[PDB]
Amino acid sequence: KCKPGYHVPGSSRKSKKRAFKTQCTQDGSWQEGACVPVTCDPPPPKFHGLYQCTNGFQFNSECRIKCEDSDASQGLGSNVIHCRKDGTWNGSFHVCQEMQGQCSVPNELNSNLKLQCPDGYAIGSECATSCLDHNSESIILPMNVTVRDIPHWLNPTRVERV
């Protein structure tokens, strides 16, 4: 049985299996078993690069978003979120007052990579990442792998927006 705040890796999120079994294998060993510390979902992407988490998004993970000149006597939002047993954060990150403005036009762009911005170039605005070739996908490759240097087993992450 997994400890409280722990579940078998790969368990369903709706019912995180806290109990598993091991068996005397034919080679004289036992079946492998583990209980990961659970992992709540990451905070919303709009706060990327702004919150620091104690141990990632695990159970009872304390993620604090950095804000300035936001007094606690006003009682607006919460800057700290803690992951719970069920797989949820006890609090929610709130947008502070010191986040406003527009964004620069993406002049630096690849020949195939186009950015369509019906929402202008505001801060927090979503710009769709499209390609001139209809069968081309806008992705980020790891810094150690270039466009030609993609291994057959590598699966680059898809970037549908910026």
From Swiss-Prot:
Known tissue expression: High levels in placenta and pregnancy serum. In placenta, expressed in X cells in septa and anchoring villi, and in syncytiotrophoblasts in the chorionic villi. Lower levels are found in a variety of other tissues including kidney, myometrium, endometrium, ovaries, breast, prostate, bone marrow, colon, fibroblasts and osteoblasts.
PTM info: There appear to be no free sulfhydryl groups.
Residues linked to a glycan: 90, 144
Span of domain Sushi: 38-98, 101-162
Entry coiled-coil feature ranges: none
Expression induction or repression: By 8-bromoadenosine-3',5'-phosphate.
Sequence similarity: Belongs to the peptidase M43B family.
Protein name: Pappalysin-1
Source species: Homo sapiens (Human)
Gene, per the UniProt record: PAPPA
Residues of the full protein shown: 1376 to 1537 of 1627
